[PDB]
Structure 1
Amino acid sequence: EKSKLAKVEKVLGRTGSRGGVIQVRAQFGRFLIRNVKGPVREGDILALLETEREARRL
């Protein structure tokens, strides 16, 4: 319901069997590794519906 805004500070790589998944590192000011669908850039802004969650390594 209530979004949380996080800033993308770099892009790490692509996962998925067909490579349709993007790994980022986002910052509120804590850091998280999150996992995105769709074209992204460093500088973009995400609307996180969950706060306590990370992505496994790639």
Structure 2
Amino acid sequence: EKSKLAKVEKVLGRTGSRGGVIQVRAQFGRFLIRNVKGPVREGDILALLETEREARRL
């Protein structure tokens, strides 16, 4: 199945049990809230899978 695109705008915070998850605002309104695994910098572009599955901020 198929990639879709959102560009990382802002890194909000590192989350999860072992700290490996990161809360992120991404631009596809056309904002999308994300939880991402692995190192992210601003101006990275994030590959979406199930595109309507917007996350819960902590």
Q: TM-score over 0.5 for the alignment? A: yes
- 1:54 positional shift: 1.5
Aligned residues: 58
CA contact (8 A) 2:12 2:23 kept: yes
Q: RMSD of the alignment, in Å?
A: 1.2
Point out the more displaced range, 8-17 or 22-31: 22-31
Segments of 4+ moved more than 2 angstroms: none
- Would the aligned equivalents of 2:6 and 2:32 in 1 still touch at CA under 8 Å? no
Query: CA 1:29 to 1:2, structure 2 compared with 1: closer, same or farther past 3 Å?
Result: farther
CA deviation after TM superposition for structure 1 residue 39, in Å: 0.2
Sequence identity of aligned pairs in percent?
100
TM value normalised by structure 2: 0.90
Give ranges in structure 2 of 5+ residues lacking alignment: none
